Design an enzyme around this catalytic site. Structure first.
Site, PDB file in Angstrom:
ATOM      1  N   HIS A 218       0.811  -1.218   0.000  1.00 32.74           N
ATOM      2  CA  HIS A 218       0.000   0.000   0.000  1.00 32.74           C
ATOM      3  C   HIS A 218       0.848   1.274   0.000  1.00 32.74           C
ATOM      4  CE1 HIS A 218       0.410   0.106   4.533  1.00 32.74           C
ATOM      5  NE2 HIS A 218       0.392   1.405   4.291  1.00 32.74           N
TER       6      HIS A 218
ATOM      7  N   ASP B 205      -0.516  -7.459   1.725  1.00 32.84           N
ATOM      8  CA  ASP B 205       0.128  -6.154   1.747  1.00 32.84           C
ATOM      9  C   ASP B 205       1.636  -6.335   1.842  1.00 32.84           C
ATOM     10  OD1 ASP B 205       0.516  -3.447   1.795  1.00 32.84           O
ATOM     11  OD2 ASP B 205      -0.097  -3.193   3.885  1.00 32.84           O
TER      12      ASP B 205
ATOM     13  N   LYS C 269     -11.320 -10.527  17.374  1.00 36.26           N
ATOM     14  CA  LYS C 269     -12.304  -9.950  18.283  1.00 36.26           C
ATOM     15  C   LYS C 269     -12.248  -8.430  18.280  1.00 36.26           C
ATOM     16  CE  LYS C 269     -12.998 -13.368  21.976  1.00 36.26           C
ATOM     17  NZ  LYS C 269     -12.781 -13.543  23.439  1.00 36.26           N
ATOM     18  N   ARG C 270     -11.067  -7.880  18.018  1.00 35.80           N
ATOM     19  CA  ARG C 270     -10.889  -6.438  18.006  1.00 35.80           C
ATOM     20  C   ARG C 270     -11.250  -5.830  16.660  1.00 35.80           C
ATOM     21  NH1 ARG C 270     -11.517  -7.434  22.978  1.00 35.80           N
ATOM     22  NH2 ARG C 270      -9.633  -8.160  24.068  1.00 35.80           N
ATOM     23  N   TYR C 271     -11.428  -6.682  15.657  1.00 38.23           N
ATOM     24  CA  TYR C 271     -11.801  -6.216  14.333  1.00 38.23           C
ATOM     25  C   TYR C 271     -12.959  -7.039  13.779  1.00 38.23           C
ATOM     26  CZ  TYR C 271      -7.632  -3.460  14.491  1.00 38.23           C
ATOM     27  OH  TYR C 271      -6.663  -2.537  14.832  1.00 38.23           O
ATOM     28  N   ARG C 272     -14.119  -6.879  14.411  1.00 44.97           N
ATOM     29  CA  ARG C 272     -15.335  -7.585  14.016  1.00 44.97           C
ATOM     30  C   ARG C 272     -15.749  -7.305  12.580  1.00 44.97           C
ATOM     31  NH1 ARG C 272     -17.753 -11.881  16.837  1.00 44.97           N
ATOM     32  NH2 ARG C 272     -17.537 -11.540  19.101  1.00 44.97           N
TER      33      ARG C 272
ATOM     34  N   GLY D 107       3.278   6.571   8.516  1.00 41.91           N
ATOM     35  CA  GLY D 107       4.671   6.797   8.183  1.00 41.91           C
ATOM     36  C   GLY D 107       5.504   5.572   8.526  1.00 41.91           C
TER      37      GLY D 107
ATOM     38  N   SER E 287       4.430   2.526   7.952  1.00 43.74           N
ATOM     39  CA  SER E 287       4.062   1.501   6.964  1.00 43.74           C
ATOM     40  C   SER E 287       5.250   0.899   6.215  1.00 43.74           C
ATOM     41  CB  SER E 287       3.109   2.089   5.925  1.00 43.74           C
ATOM     42  OG  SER E 287       1.855   2.377   6.494  1.00 43.74           O
ATOM     43  N   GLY E 288       5.214  -0.415   6.000  1.00 42.30           N
ATOM     44  CA  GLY E 288       6.287  -1.070   5.275  1.00 42.30           C
ATOM     45  C   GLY E 288       7.471  -1.455   6.134  1.00 42.30           C
TER      46      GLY E 288
HETATM   47  B1  368 Z   1       1.480   3.787   6.459  1.00 47.76           B
HETATM   48  C1  368 Z   1       0.518   3.805   7.640  1.00 47.76           C
HETATM   49  C2  368 Z   1       0.977   3.386   8.934  1.00 47.76           C
HETATM   50  C3  368 Z   1       0.105   3.393  10.056  1.00 47.76           C
HETATM   51  C4  368 Z   1      -1.250   3.817   9.931  1.00 47.76           C
HETATM   52  C5  368 Z   1      -2.131   3.815  11.184  1.00 47.76           C
HETATM   53  C6  368 Z   1      -2.577   2.434  11.679  1.00 47.76           C
HETATM   54  N1  368 Z   1      -1.512   1.879  12.527  1.00 47.76           N
HETATM   55  C7  368 Z   1      -1.658   1.071  13.581  1.00 47.76           C
HETATM   56  N2  368 Z   1      -2.650   1.296  14.451  1.00 47.76           N
HETATM   57  N3  368 Z   1      -0.817   0.049  13.772  1.00 47.76           N
HETATM   58  O1  368 Z   1      -3.281   4.708  10.997  1.00 47.76           O
HETATM   59  C8  368 Z   1      -3.149   6.062  11.156  1.00 47.76           C
HETATM   60  O2  368 Z   1      -2.110   6.622  11.450  1.00 47.76           O
HETATM   61  C9  368 Z   1      -4.457   6.766  10.915  1.00 47.76           C
HETATM   62  C10 368 Z   1      -5.651   6.087  10.457  1.00 47.76           C
HETATM   63  C11 368 Z   1      -6.860   6.822  10.252  1.00 47.76           C
HETATM   64  C12 368 Z   1      -6.845   8.210  10.506  1.00 47.76           C
HETATM   65  N4  368 Z   1      -5.726   8.865  10.937  1.00 47.76           N
HETATM   66  C13 368 Z   1      -4.570   8.162  11.134  1.00 47.76           C
HETATM   67  C14 368 Z   1      -1.718   4.233   8.633  1.00 47.76           C
HETATM   68  C15 368 Z   1      -0.845   4.226   7.507  1.00 47.76           C
HETATM   69  O3  368 Z   1       2.542   4.735   6.651  1.00 47.76           O
HETATM   70  C16 368 Z   1       2.700   5.478   5.452  1.00 47.76           C
HETATM   71  C17 368 Z   1       1.300   5.424   4.827  1.00 47.76           C
HETATM   72  C18 368 Z   1       1.379   5.572   3.303  1.00 47.76           C
HETATM   73  O4  368 Z   1       0.217   5.054   2.707  1.00 47.76           O
HETATM   74  O5  368 Z   1       0.855   4.136   5.204  1.00 47.76           O
END
Ligand code: 368
Length: 237
Positions: A44, A93, A160-163, A186, A188-189
């Site tokens: 993603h 992903d 259970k945390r993601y119904r 940020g 992510s990945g």
């Molecule tokens: B990703 C990226 C990383 C983390 C998130 C988080 C979910 N993380 C978690 N709980 N483990 O969600 C948010 O930060 C969020 C969600 C909804 C509204 N506000 C904030 C999301 C995304 O890092 C770079 C990005 C690029 O697509 O994806």
């Protein structure tokens, strides 16, 4: 990373900061070195990325301040997204980045061992998630690589945390029932690293979650071990 602390230089040598140069350079996602020419990250992360030419991978980085226009980086020769991936919350992903050049290993930049199918029964008790992501919600990319120790949670408990979602065996979750520590935008990945028998394994890849560090909302990661066959196939010339 929410509720974490500043990492020590070279403490997570497999962690890379993936940047995009469009419109202007900025950190885009985290990633893990798994081979002299391979970075494992989340699929993603490349929403809207039409060409690998705008991507830049930086290894052996602690603070983003280390990154300037005159800083050496690895170009991306090819972006490889799992062909079944549609979106993070659906699974698959996972993505591979083939670098235009080879990474010369050193204490600041070395690969992380992938989990073995004979480790699925292994119970990790020392796992950490790292990244330059938000410390809070609606925040901004951090300068210093953050780290946070987080216990894994069974899929039955995660479900259970993601119904409203379907937590498959190709996903693995981690978090405290009370929240407080977690990956955030940020991150992510990036890796979910677990230390088992003095050896570090790339157990998961930061994929998604609900908000950040909320109570009863464990972070969801790609279950890397479920992809070792995919990874072999895609990295074999
Ligand atoms: B990703 C990226 C990383 C983390 C998130 C988080 C979910 N993380 C978690 N709980 N483990 O969600 C948010 O930060 C969020 C969600 C909804 C509204 N506000 C904030 C999301 C995304 O890092 C770079 C990005 C690029 O697509 O994806």
């Amino acid at each position: 990373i929410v509720g974490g602390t500043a990492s020590v230089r070279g403490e997570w040598p497999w962690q890379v900061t993936l940047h995009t140069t469009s419109p202007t350079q900025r950190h885009l996602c985290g990633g893990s070195i798994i081979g002299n020419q391979w970075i494992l990250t989340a699929a993603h992360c490349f929403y809207g990325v039409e060409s690998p030419k705008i991507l830049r991978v930086y290894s052996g980085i602690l603070n983003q301040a280390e990154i300037a226009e005159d800083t050496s980086f690895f170009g991306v020769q090819e972006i490889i997204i799992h062909d079944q991936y549609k979106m993070a919350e659906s699974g698959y992903d996972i993505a591979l980045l083939k670098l235009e050049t080879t990474v010369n290993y050193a204490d600041s930049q070395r690969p992380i061992s992938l989990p073995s199918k004979g480790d699925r029964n292994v119970i990790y008790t020392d796992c950490w998630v790292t990244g330059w992501g938000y410390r809070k919600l609606r925040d901004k990319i951090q300068n210093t690589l953050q780290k946070a120790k987080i216990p894994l949670v069974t899929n039955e408990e995660c479900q259970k945390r993601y119904r409203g979602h379907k937590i498959t065996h190709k996903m693995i979750c981690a978090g405290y029932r009370e929240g407080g520590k977690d990956a955030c935008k940020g991150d992510s990945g990036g890796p979910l690293s677990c230390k088992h028998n003095e050896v570090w394994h790339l157990v998961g890849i930061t994929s998604w979650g609900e908000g950040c560090a909320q109570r009863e909302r464990p972070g969801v990661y790609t279950n890397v071990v479920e992809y070792v066959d995919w990874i072999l196939e895609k990295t074999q010339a």
